[PDB]
Design a protein around this ligand. Structure first.
Ligand SMILES: [Mg+2]
Ligand SMILES: [Mg+2]
Ligand SMILES: [Mg+2]
Ligand SMILES: [Mg+2]
Ligand SMILES: [Mg+2]
Ligand SMILES: [Mg+2]
Ligand SMILES: [Mg+2]
Ligand SMILES: [Mg+2]
Ligand SMILES: [Mg+2]
Ligand SMILES: [Mg+2]
Ligand SMILES: [Mg+2]
Ligand SMILES: [Mg+2]
Ligand SMILES: [Mg+2]
Ligand SMILES: [Mg+2]
Ligand SMILES: [Mg+2]
Ligand SMILES: [Mg+2]
Ligand SMILES: [Mg+2]
Ligand SMILES: [Mg+2]
Ligand SMILES: [Mg+2]
Ligand SMILES: [Mg+2]
Ligand SMILES: [Mg+2]
Ligand SMILES: [Mg+2]
Ligand SMILES: [Mg+2]
Ligand SMILES: [Mg+2]
Ligand SMILES: [Mg+2]
Ligand SMILES: [Mg+2]
Ligand SMILES: [Mg+2]
Ligand SMILES: [Mg+2]
Ligand SMILES: [Mg+2]
Ligand SMILES: [Mg+2]
Ligand SMILES: [Mg+2]
Ligand SMILES: [Mg+2]
Ligand SMILES: [Mg+2]
Ligand SMILES: [Mg+2]
Ligand SMILES: [Mg+2]
Ligand SMILES: [Mg+2]
Ligand SMILES: [Mg+2]
Ligand SMILES: [Mg+2]
Ligand SMILES: [Mg+2]
Ligand SMILES: [Mg+2]
Ligand SMILES: [Mg+2]
Ligand SMILES: [Mg+2]
Ligand SMILES: [Mg+2]
Ligand SMILES: [Mg+2]
Ligand SMILES: [Mg+2]
Ligand SMILES: [Mg+2]
Ligand SMILES: [Mg+2]
Ligand SMILES: [Mg+2]
Ligand SMILES: [Mg+2]
Ligand SMILES: [Mg+2]
Ligand SMILES: [Mg+2]
Ligand SMILES: [Mg+2]
Ligand SMILES: [Mg+2]
Ligand SMILES: [Mg+2]
Ligand SMILES: [Mg+2]
Ligand SMILES: [Mg+2]
Ligand SMILES: [Mg+2]
Ligand SMILES: [Mg+2]
Ligand SMILES: [Mg+2]
Ligand SMILES: [Mg+2]
Ligand SMILES: [Mg+2]
Ligand SMILES: [Mg+2]
Ligand SMILES: [Mg+2]
Ligand SMILES: [Mg+2]
Ligand SMILES: [Mg+2]
Ligand SMILES: [Mg+2]
Ligand SMILES: [Mg+2]
Ligand SMILES: [Mg+2]
Ligand SMILES: [Mg+2]
Ligand SMILES: [Mg+2]
Ligand SMILES: [Mg+2]
Ligand SMILES: [Mg+2]
Ligand SMILES: [Mg+2]
Ligand SMILES: [Mg+2]
Ligand SMILES: [Mg+2]
Ligand SMILES: [Mg+2]
Lengths: 52, 81, 64, 96
RNA sequence: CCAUAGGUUAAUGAGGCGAACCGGGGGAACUGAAACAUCUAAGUACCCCGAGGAAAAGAAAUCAACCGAGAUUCCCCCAG
RNA sequence: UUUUGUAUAAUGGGUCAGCGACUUAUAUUCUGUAGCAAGGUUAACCGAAUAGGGGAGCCGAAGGGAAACCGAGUCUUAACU
RNA sequence: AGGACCGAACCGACUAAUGUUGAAAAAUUAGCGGAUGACUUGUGGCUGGGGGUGAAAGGCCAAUCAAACCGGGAGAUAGCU
RNA sequence: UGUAACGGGGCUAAACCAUGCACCGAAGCUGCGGCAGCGACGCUUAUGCGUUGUUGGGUAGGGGAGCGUUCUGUAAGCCUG
RNA sequence: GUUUAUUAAAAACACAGCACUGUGCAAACACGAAAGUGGACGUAUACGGUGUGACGCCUGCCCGGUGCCGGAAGGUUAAU
RNA sequence: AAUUCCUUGUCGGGUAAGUUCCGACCUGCACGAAUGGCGUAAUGAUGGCCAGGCUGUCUCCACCCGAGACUCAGUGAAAUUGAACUCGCUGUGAAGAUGCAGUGUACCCGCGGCAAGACGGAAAGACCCCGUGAACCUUUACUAUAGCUUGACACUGAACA
RNA sequence: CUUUAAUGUUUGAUGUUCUAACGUUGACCCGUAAUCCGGGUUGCGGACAGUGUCUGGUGGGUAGUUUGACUGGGGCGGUCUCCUCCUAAAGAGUAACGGAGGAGCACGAAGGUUGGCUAAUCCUGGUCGGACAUCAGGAGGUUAGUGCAAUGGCAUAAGCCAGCUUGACUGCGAGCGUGACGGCGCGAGCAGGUGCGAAAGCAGGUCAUAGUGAUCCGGUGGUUCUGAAUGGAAGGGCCAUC
């Protein structure tokens, strides 16, 4: 179970987040995806943050 | 003279596959017809194929089993009703 | 003496109009990143208590 | 709730919600209860004198249930839309 | 050394018993939890001290909610 | 009596007579029955008193929602075909 | 002189038989060990229950001991008969 | 342990095969009589009365209807030297 | 010599002796909420505990583990 | 070997013959030095073996003496017990029959004896399993704790360095 | 400001001595006719010791308890959840300490879409080069491949290359399947916003079926929903998540 879990924080200022996993050994670079934000009702770039 | 064992005790649960509605059997839209692993059957008219190759009715009507194609594959279609 | 209410079932169940009981679904408290959003979306709304387990609830909740 | 040693239903299932203290001091009023007061005015102290809502109650709504056949002044209470139409049709005067 | 401790006389009172109720000082475990240790049983049983015909408490550094109530004790609700 | 199953060589009883085991209290639900009926009913207590009074209250006639709140609708949702 | 020797009282209890609803809830008969010693016995006293005492067998503590007896919690609990 | 591998006697059919007509044989079926349950239908129900079918083994267990005992009212009544 | 009164008297216990170890006296230790008492009206040639068990010849190697004793430089570490 | 499984180890002695005994060997399953090693005079109601004497222990029992047993008179129990008009055999069958089936045998009732059966009597099997039973005991099981010990504060102060 | 001294107090640390607390199971006197005790003188010790509260360690010395089930008897051994095949008797389902195998993940591309492509093996020829690298042709026709076990599928490929991308979307969900239940599964379509494609269309993770853990308790972010006189707040609730 080396594939740790992270969260994809909205860059729209909202604290909305998707949660997911990654292999931080083989993918050291940060994950950035363009996902739907249901508060703003737009597709906004999300960035990787810690699952906390 | 005590001894032995059995490395072969396991089995899984029965998944209850098969054909839920047979031919000439009136169904509602969305009704599961067949649950199956592969495409042992194939989706014909007014019949959708699920994520797990489950055949469901997209409309209302009677189930029609039929063999089509050059490979003699078994298709399921919904007749109007 | 009075019957005493099972206070956990009083914190877990609510009586509806025709006498049925609503309850929260399970499986929506943790371990949530591996579950599909469809599953969670069908677990947020309250569900009715089934006919089989409705007797144990009424036995635990005598005062409605 | 004992199911054998199986985990019973009231512990398989999660707790939810909280209890509002304001709901214990709120009440709902039929339109049929409006005639049971005297003076043709409806307050909290009038309904409590008529033994309808109870003493500790501080808030009350009037709901379209039953029917009224007399003009009644409603004062200091919330009224639903259908009860507002039935009161104003029977001659009432909803105020604050 | 004074003094004090101590000694002796005299007067008054107490002591002991007793069914329950009462106030207080200590204070279990079996059991139940389908085990068990937190918990329960239960401040129960038991022991001890003291009192009265009853005792205890008692005249707000109390509640309430911006309206107000007006010592203590007891019963029915509130409310399982 | 217990048992898949006892003439069982499975249990119990020497016999007679007497005693000997699903109760009681309070809550709750259902059925029946009786009274009143969108209302029904009082407890404490008073009372010379199984009366009458007493309607503190309880249940019901409205629900939904975690809740505020809305109300024959309400919740979910930006909004529901 | 002797925790010396043989051997009665006295103390003990190795073997056999009897007896085993006994004469006796541990004894009798025939033999047996010690018998001036770490002996034995009388009277009175002290140690109290998770405690005593024990040349130590879990032995003894009123015919009861891997925790006495009596009363109480107590109608403990018993998914067992 | 005693014939002891037709149930026995016994059987050369009183065995076997085939066919046929008889008969015996159950608490089965039928007959006669009687009780009760549940349904029909009709009456004109007195809320049960004809006819009518059919049903009636039964543990655990569920439902329905009763007998008898002691005591209280009826009862300062009735029975009883 | 002792022992399972009531199925075991023995090779079991004890024993004289030996060794280790504690104890400086208000001794250690033990019984006691405590006061106190025993040890002991004794004082290291004494007392307690443990093991062995007359006498004769002897008692060899291992301190890694677990204990105990001694150390106090460093690390860690409580209430405060 | 109070220790040795293999083992009645092998050899020797003793005996007509010795899985025991004694003495050796050592291949010590799995002795061993104060939970002492090896010897050891004396002692032991101690364990094993051998011999002499002795004898009813036995070959193989016989007779006798007494106390019962047996009979009479008197008193007078007990355990046990569903009811009994309470046979054998073969079979059957909760799988080992007085009671069933088939068959055989048997006049009714005592007394003295024996003990093969009544799965005989006595004691709700002590063995075994089970119980979310109990008790006691153990320990580097868990959680506590007496006790011992450490330090802080208090009782607790004054000076000097 | 930097760097330390002076004087003094606020004061801690270790000694140094003292006496007045405290101790005395040292002597003497009195109560006293008394080896207790108390008082007094004196000597020694001396703020030590010793007690109380708090605290760390040790602590079977003592106490309360736990120490699983299946089991061709119990123990020992093995097993306990999930997936695949057979047993399983041509719908589903179906047991044994029956026969055989796997899982407790992976992937930010190994997902989506558009476009295109089609294997294994063998034969011949051919530099190093060899049974077997790469190259060309031919037979063959999926005997291959599928991230991993088995089964069922797969050419319209679900297999293999490249481009652009994030639908590995949020709210819902008619209707069915499956379970005693908790729960698990499939799902067209709707609203919003998005990607690829000219477009029709496809996309709510992967060819499917294993890759998992209830509740409680607690943590983090968001949200006035609540907020015990009132305004806030704490705390709670709801949503996401650990
Ligand atoms: Mg949550
Ligand atoms: Mg469990
Ligand atoms: Mg307890
Ligand atoms: Mg207990
Ligand atoms: Mg319990
Ligand atoms: Mg008074
Ligand atoms: Mg005022
Ligand atoms: Mg019986
Ligand atoms: Mg049986
Ligand atoms: Mg039965
Ligand atoms: Mg049986
Ligand atoms: Mg029979
Ligand atoms: Mg018999
Ligand atoms: Mg019998
Ligand atoms: Mg039995
Ligand atoms: Mg009997
Ligand atoms: Mg009787
Ligand atoms: Mg009732
Ligand atoms: Mg009624
Ligand atoms: Mg609606
Ligand atoms: Mg002598
Ligand atoms: Mg003698
Ligand atoms: Mg002698
Ligand atoms: Mg023993
Ligand atoms: Mg005794
Ligand atoms: Mg005791
Ligand atoms: Mg005990
Ligand atoms: Mg009790
Ligand atoms: Mg009892
Ligand atoms: Mg013929
Ligand atoms: Mg007949
Ligand atoms: Mg008949
Ligand atoms: Mg008839
Ligand atoms: Mg019949
Ligand atoms: Mg019947
Ligand atoms: Mg019955
Ligand atoms: Mg009468
Ligand atoms: Mg001796
Ligand atoms: Mg003796
Ligand atoms: Mg004895
Ligand atoms: Mg003896
Ligand atoms: Mg002393
Ligand atoms: Mg020894
Ligand atoms: Mg040594
Ligand atoms: Mg060491
Ligand atoms: Mg040390
Ligand atoms: Mg430290
Ligand atoms: Mg050995
Ligand atoms: Mg041997
Ligand atoms: Mg020999
Ligand atoms: Mg011999
Ligand atoms: Mg020898
Ligand atoms: Mg040894
Ligand atoms: Mg040694
Ligand atoms: Mg020795
Ligand atoms: Mg006689
Ligand atoms: Mg008798
Ligand atoms: Mg027989
Ligand atoms: Mg006879
Ligand atoms: Mg016999
Ligand atoms: Mg005899
Ligand atoms: Mg017997
Ligand atoms: Mg028994
Ligand atoms: Mg213990
Ligand atoms: Mg078991
Ligand atoms: Mg075994
Ligand atoms: Mg099948
Ligand atoms: Mg089938
Ligand atoms: Mg793929
Ligand atoms: Mg294509
Ligand atoms: Mg080549
Ligand atoms: Mg793919
Ligand atoms: Mg796959
Ligand atoms: Mg819990
Ligand atoms: Mg607010
Ligand atoms: Mg506030």
């Amino acid at each position: 179970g080396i594939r740790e879990k992270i969260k994809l924080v909205s860059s729209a200022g909202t604290g909305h987040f998707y949660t997911t996993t990654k292999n931080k050994r083989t993918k050291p670079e940060k994950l950035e995806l363009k996902k739907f934000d249901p508060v703003v009702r737009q597709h906004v770039i999300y960035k990787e943050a810690k699952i906390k | 003279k005590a001894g032995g064992s059995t490395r072969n005790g396991r089995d899984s649960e029965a998944k209850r596959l098969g054909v839920k509605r047979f031919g000439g059997e009136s169904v509602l839209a969305g009704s599961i017809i067949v649950r199956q692993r592969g495409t042992k059957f194939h989706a014909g008219a007014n019949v959708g194929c699920g994520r797990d190759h489950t055949l469901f009715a997209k409309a209302d009507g009677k189930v029609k089993f039929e063999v089509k194609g050059p490979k003699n594959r078994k298709f399921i279609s919904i007749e109007a009703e | 003496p009075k019957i005493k209410t099972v206070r956990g079932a009083a914190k877990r169940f609510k009586k509806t109009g025709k006498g049925g009981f609503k309850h929260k679904h399970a499986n929506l408290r943790h371990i949530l990143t591996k579950k599909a959003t469809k599953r969670k979306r069908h677990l947020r709304p309250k569900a009715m208590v089934s006919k089989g387990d409705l007797g144990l609830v009424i036995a635990c909740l005598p005062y409605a | 709730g004992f199911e054998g040693g199986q985990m019973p239903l009231y512990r398989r299932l999660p707790k939810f919600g909280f209890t509002s203290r304001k709901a214990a001091i709120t009440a709902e009023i039929r339109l049929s209860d409006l005639a049971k007061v005297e003076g043709g005015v409806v307050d909290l102290n009038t309904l409590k004198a008529a033994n309808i809502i109870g003493i500790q109650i501080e808030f009350a709504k009037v709901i379209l249930a039953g029917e009224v056949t007399t003009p009644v002044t409603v004062r200091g209470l919330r009224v639903t839309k259908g009860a507002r139409a039935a009161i104003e049709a029977a001659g009432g005067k909803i105020e604050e």
